[PDB]
Design an enzyme around this catalytic site. Structure first.
Site, PDB file in Angstrom:
ATOM      1  CB  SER A  43      61.145  77.061  -0.722  1.00 35.69           C
ATOM      2  OG  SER A  43      62.359  77.723  -1.030  1.00 35.69           O
ATOM      3  N   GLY A  70      62.646  79.209  -4.860  1.00 36.04           N
ATOM      4  CA  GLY A  70      62.595  80.204  -5.916  1.00 36.04           C
ATOM      5  C   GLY A  70      62.146  79.717  -7.289  1.00 36.04           C
ATOM      6  CG  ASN A 100      58.323  80.556  -5.888  1.00 32.01           C
ATOM      7  OD1 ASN A 100      57.856  81.109  -4.885  1.00 32.01           O
ATOM      8  ND2 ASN A 100      59.174  79.559  -5.806  1.00 32.01           N
ATOM      9  CG  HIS A 191      59.265  79.668   3.230  1.00 32.70           C
ATOM     10  ND1 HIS A 191      59.572  81.007   3.100  1.00 32.70           N
ATOM     11  CD2 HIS A 191      59.673  79.075   2.084  1.00 32.70           C
ATOM     12  CE1 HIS A 191      60.139  81.214   1.922  1.00 32.70           C
ATOM     13  NE2 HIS A 191      60.209  80.057   1.286  1.00 32.70           N
TER      14      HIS A 191
HETATM   15 CA   LIG Z   1      60.190  79.972  -2.481  1.00 29.77          CA
END
Ligand SMILES: [Ca+2]
Lengths: 211, 212
Positions: A43, A70, A100, A191
């Site tokens: 992401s 992801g 991740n 994020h």
């Molecule tokens: Ca992510």
């Protein structure tokens, strides 16, 4: 055996097949375009334009963004081996994955990254690879910060001295003296917000020009 | 007994305890802030604040955004009952949740959103509630589009009921004739781009201006 380096696609468990739809689009939109810079990762790569944008510092570079939220290292590896690296000949490939890979050690994740770089060096030998450091995460000190930090150490070492691969720790110091990360830089402490991305893209741009 | 209607916190399985950190921050905002419009829900709500449209259309309304990516009806319920509805008295509350309620049937998801509305006008009986319809998702036709459509239809019938609530189901040209959704509207065939939000926010903003 290293699961972080064993190529594998993300299985659909919701029903709308979005992961494969992205991959296929990346495969198709490339056999019609000739980018100079290609981004691929999780992401953090996908949402890169959620700050300023992607033209006042990246679009002039004729770039493609193959980031998918992801994804872990083994996922990016599978995509690179299954069509996303075909039909194109970029000058630079930007990699940003690893945060991740829960359940894998810093050493395993590091191996995952090295396999990705190696794959790009074999299929796209003319390009230079840029690996971005895993960013810190969580509002307060936690195991994932240590893990990510360790991965950067190991990757920095394996990449230092590498003929055509460069490690860039684009973290301006999101973790403050009190051990916290501000939601202004990372709205969910993972994020990046618009102002969080600035320092990252800034450092990324300064290196892309140097190469 | 509807599982989607039972409040439940999203347990941290990663280790960075990000879910609670966000919740606590929302509780913190509830302390030194006094909004007129409160936005609660999932990524559809949260991500809206990361686009310029938010500053131009909603920042002027003194609005707070308690959206959390990945949240389900259960998660939203838990947050609303645990402090996110205290120390504030919003005139308008925007709810947008349900698209992440995987494993739950359309009927369960509808029931969970209703539970949310009920809890809201219980804690905030003076607030007018706006429930946003679940958006289509997936590049091509798939089970979730059907599931999400059924939830909106079920809500349309159950929401005229209950106090101070209405379903806003605006739909752009998201699903074309060829049955496909363009990555220009939803970049990952789920989350909206700026162009995608433009089609949804404008109508949402006029209804808010109205209600206010
Ligand atoms: Ca992510």
């Amino acid at each position: 055996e290293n699961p972080a380096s064993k190529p594998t696609p993300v299985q659909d468990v919701q029903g709308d097949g979005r992961w494969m739809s992205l991959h296929h689009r990346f495969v198709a939109d490339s056999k019609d375009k000739e980018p100079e810079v290609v981004f691929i990762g999780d992401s953090l790569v996908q949402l890169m334009h959620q700050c300023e944008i992607w033209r006042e510092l990246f679009s002039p570079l004729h770039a493609l963004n193959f980031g998918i939220g992801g994804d872990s290292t083994q996922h990016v590896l599978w995509r690179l081996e299954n069509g996303e690296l075909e039909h194109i000949r970029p000058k630079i490939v930007v990699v940003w994955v690893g945060t991740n890979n829960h359940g894998h050690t810093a050493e395993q994740v590091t191996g995952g990254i090295k396999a990705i770089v190696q794959l790009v060096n074999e299929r796209q030998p003319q390009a230079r690879v840029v690996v971005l450091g895993l960013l810190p995460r969580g509002q307060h000190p936690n195991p994932l910060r240590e893990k990510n930090r360790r991965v950067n150490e190991l990757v920095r070492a394996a990449l230092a001295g590498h003929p055509r691969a460069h490690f860039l720790d684009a973290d301006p110091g999101f973790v403050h003296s009190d051990g916290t990360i501000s939601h202004h830089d990372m709205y969910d402490y993972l994020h990046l917000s618009r102002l969080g991305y600035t320092p990252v893209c800034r450092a990324l741009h300064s290196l892309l020009l140097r190469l | 007994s509807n599982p989607a209607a039972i409040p439940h916190a999203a347990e941290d399985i990663q280790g960075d305890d990000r879910w609670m950190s966000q919740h606590n921050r929302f509780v913190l905002d509830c302390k030194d802030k006094e909004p007129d419009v409160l936005f609660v829900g999932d990524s559809m709500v949260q991500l809206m604040q990361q686009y310029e449209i938010w500053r131009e259309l909603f920042s002027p309304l003194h609005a707070l955004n308690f959206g959390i990516g990945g949240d389900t009806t259960r998660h939203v319920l838990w947050r609303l009952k645990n402090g996110e509805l205290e120390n504030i008295k919003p005139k308008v509350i925007v709810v947008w949740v349900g698209t992440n309620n995987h494993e739950n049937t359309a009927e369960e998801v509808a029931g969970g959103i209703e539970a949310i509305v009920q809890l809201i006008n219980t804690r905030q009986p003076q607030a007018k509630i706006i429930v946003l319809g679940l958006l289509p998702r997936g590049e091509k036709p798939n089970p979730l589009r059907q599931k999400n459509a059924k939830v909106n239809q079920l809500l349309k019938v159950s929401l005229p009921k209950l106090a101070n609530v209405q379903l806003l189901d605006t739909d752009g040209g998201f699903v074309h004739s060829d049955g496909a959704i363009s990555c220009h509207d939803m970049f990952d065939f789920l989350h909206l781009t700026g162009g995608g939000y433009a089609k949804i926010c404008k109508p949402l903003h006029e209804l808010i201006m109205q209600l206010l």
